Symmetry: C2
Subunit: 363 residues, 2 copies
């Protein structure tokens, strides 16, 4: 049967959902709630058959949908999960971060415990082809992952609808908003929960000259995070939002006693100027310990997927797995509520550590 989606919030990333759903056989967007006119026009040009609703209540009351995507601003997510839970529980793909406000953790945990349908948190990085390749090969190459290092070097946060992503109260803070992906990757690779975070971070460069109602953006733009895991593995994140010139936006290194594996992940092709030549191809580098003979493999993305989004086709691959769960051919929520909450708790811990200059314990 066809899978019919409803979308709550349809700006840049909700438009990337619309384009990638459109590439799936047997899926369609039937319903959209998007309160911004310009975005309503942009969504209506992408998905002309989709009906618009004036509210979440109106969409849930009348739409014929099998599942929902939340792509509203970060601070909206927890209230919209609670509203859907009280109104019409459906399989839900909630954009990261799962939530922004620590005060919401108890009530959302209780909501998720009682929610009779899947909750999938849309941390799609594991499906970027170079990252997926590293995940599939890391155990065999490393002989067990002792250390995992992740580096994000990119350009400053884009301008958003109502400028929402310029303030911590709206985003959850930069380690929550941008780095939840990397924290979740640490748990996926190491297959253990974190026990401690140590961080250093600041707002060194970005948005310091910007004013909104007389207020200065307060979001971090760089830092380092060390994460200790139950039983002894360790990981490190490096973030810089003013490193626009880096050839690869993400690099991920996994090391163990038999070898090392590294992924090189390009940024969005739309931000690679044509005057710079062809964008970088994604790579994986395998460096076995005993031979010292390195292997480099190109892991290109299907051009149709590069056309549909900014995340190396990962949004499409995420939807294929989500649709399989909605259809019932799969039982698996690959990125659960609990994975989303761990990744948020790790970013909150990093922000608290960076603010206090002290280690932060997690339980």
């Amino acid at each position: 049967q066809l899978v019919r989606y409803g979308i709550i919030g349809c700006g840049m990333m909700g438009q990337e959902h619309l384009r990638n759903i459109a590439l799936l056989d047997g899926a369609g967007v039937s319903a959209i709630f998007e309160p911004d006119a310009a975005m309503q026009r942009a969504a209506h040009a992408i998905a002309p058959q989709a009906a618009f609703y004036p509210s979440v209540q109106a969409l849930l009351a009348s739409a014929d949908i099998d599942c929902l995507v939340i792509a509203s601003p970060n601070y909206c997510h927890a209230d919209q999960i609670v509203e859907i839970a009280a109104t019409r529980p459906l399989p839900l793909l909630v954009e990261k971060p799962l939530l922004t406000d620590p005060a919401d953790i108890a009530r959302l945990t209780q909501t998720a415990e009682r929610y009779p349908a899947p909750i999938w948190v849309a941390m799609e990085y594991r499906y970027m082809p170079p990252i997926a390749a590293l995940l599939a090969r890391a155990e065999a190459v490393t002989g067990g992952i002792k250390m995992l290092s992740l580096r994000e070097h990119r350009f400053p946060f884009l301008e958003k609808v109502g400028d929402w992503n310029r303030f911590n109260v709206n985003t959850g803070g930069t380690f929550v908003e941008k780095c939840c992906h990397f924290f979740d990757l640490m748990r996926l690779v190491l297959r253990r929960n974190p026990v401690r975070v140590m961080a250093s971070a600041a707002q060194s460069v970005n948005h310091l000259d910007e004013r909104y109602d007389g207020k200065t953006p307060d979001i971090l733009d760089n830092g380092y995070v060390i994460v200790d895991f139950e039983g002894g593995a360790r990981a490190m994140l490096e973030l810089c939002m003013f490193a626009d010139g880096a050839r690869y936006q993400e690099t991920i290194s996994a090391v163990g006693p038999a070898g090392k594996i590294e992924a090189f992940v390009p940024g969005p092709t739309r931000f690679w100027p044509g005057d710079l030549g062809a964008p970088p191809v994604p790579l994986i580098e395998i460096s076995p310990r005993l031979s010292k003979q390195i292997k480099v493999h190109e892991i290109p993305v299907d051009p149709k997927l590069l056309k549909a989004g900014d995340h190396n086709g990962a949004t499409y691959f995420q939807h294929q797995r989500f649709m399989a769960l909605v259809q019932g051919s799969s039982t698996e929520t690959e990125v659960s509520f609990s994975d989303g909450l761990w990744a948020v708790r790790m970013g909150m811990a990093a922000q608290h550590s960076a603010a206090t200059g002290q280690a932060v314990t997690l339980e």
Copy 2:
């Protein structure tokens, strides 16, 4: 001044003739590099191990051997001294030299191992009438030198400095001395003093805080020395905060033998990024794999996005003389000029050596306790 006692805390609340003392692997590197200097020679060696005395004699056949520090100082015709003894020996030997025959000294890293020696060694250095140069040579490796010269201009000001060392396990040493923290000072002191010093040099500021995670995860766990298992760390991460707000990160892995580049160093600021790619010793590159990796620097300007890569090759003659990309030779050129009086600058001071050791001790304490460690100076 710093105050830390009970509940009181100021921070952290919410011809030139050379004598050689020690002539194993690194003292033999000093012999080969001194021999490349015009108007320098090794006149005197104290090396207590017969097999190393034979190896040292084959390299520097005109050098005279002495049975102790006291014997060398009593009768050797020398203008300066190199200390390349095991780490735990350095403090006692500096004190001995200061009491007997102070001369210009090139003291191998780490400057010391035991925090109980800091006060007495600082007293010795304050009263010492000749230069003390701590032999942290990495700044002279051609790719690192290029990064140090260009980083301010490329970055528009260094906000972040990331250093990574991926290499093979600690080599076997005379009497197995480098297998035990009491002998080495711990791995962040023995191996990573170089990187902590490069952070102070690049950022031109002192550290205020260290956060670290480290362990002995893999290496030497199956070795036994008359019942003792080695206790040295083999991997970790260190975050260092600086006066003025710059931050740095060190990543160490002593079981990443396969990494093409043994050291990589990245500096990032609002105008761009610079990265150095530093090969390990050519003698450990398998000849079946072809030519060893060429040192490189990569310039990534923020607004242009026009990336440039430069090859920075080391003179073959210097690669034949040592394991450190010719840096031992460059160090010796500068030290020799200071001994001759053509220069007055000690580029790597006692204080620089002590800072790098204190940063490694803080990292080890932070990793052992799971807590941030404050530093004052």
